Design a protein around this ligand. Structure first.
Ligand SMILES: CSc1ccccc1[C@H]1CCCN1C(=O)CNC(=O)NCc1ccc2c(c1)[C@@H]1C[C@H](N2)[C@H](O)CO1
Length: 164
């Protein structure tokens, strides 16, 4: 089966709630596993204590740079970067979970949760899951963003892990 993972998110030290994500290990097992292990922190590093560095209303919420905290970093459980597994899953609408990148075959740890259908990203960013519950929390994160992507509050992943 597919893993269920979670992100507990805060804004300036105040809890916003929980985002539960299904990771599509049935379609992209390598990409799903990388995200799963970064949530648990079982490799000695991961998302706990990192931020949503770029939040653009009516687009997406981007996070996962746990090394540089500015959008230039992060790393995968495999190494600094890994190939694009496939582009089978599409950016069909809000709640889609997909890999950020610096062009072809540059997946690391940065990811984004869509707040609209981002179909122009199909075949360019690897989709590997979706929001199961807590889309209201994603909308709360979205409200602290701007068209520049800059946030009005520091959005932190205070805790994360695996549910099943
Ligand atoms: C900016 S709004 C926009 C507009 C059109 C389309 C998309 C986007 C945004 C939002 C959706 C995903 N998205 C983006 O992905 C843009 N790109 C990066 O941020 N790139 C930074 C990055 C990420 C990941 C890795 C790196 C750099 C390298 C390579 C590798 N991973 C190593 O682990 C660390 O350094």
């Amino acid at each position: 089966g597919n893993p269920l993972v979670y992100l507990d998110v805060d804004a300036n030290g105040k809890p916003l709630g929980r985002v539960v994500l299904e990771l599509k290990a049935d379609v992209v097992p390598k990409t799903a596993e990388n995200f799963r292990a970064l949530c648990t922190g079982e490799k000695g590093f991961g998302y706990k204590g990192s931020t949503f560095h770029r939040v653009i209303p009516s687009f997406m919420c981007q996070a996962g740079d746990f090394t540089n905290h500015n959008g230039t970093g992060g790393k995968s459980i495999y190494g600094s970067r890994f190939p694009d597994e496939n582009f089978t899953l599409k950016h069909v609408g809000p709640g889609v979970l997909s890999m950020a990148n610096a062009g072809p075959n540059t997946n690391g740890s940065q990811f984004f949760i869509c707040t609209i259908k981002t179909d122009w990203l199909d075949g360019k960013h690897v989709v590997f899951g979706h929001v199961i519950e807590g889309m209201d929390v994603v909308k709360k994160i979205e409200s602290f963003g701007s068209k520049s992507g800059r946030t009005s509050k520091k959005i932190v992943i205070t805790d994360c892990g695996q549910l099943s």
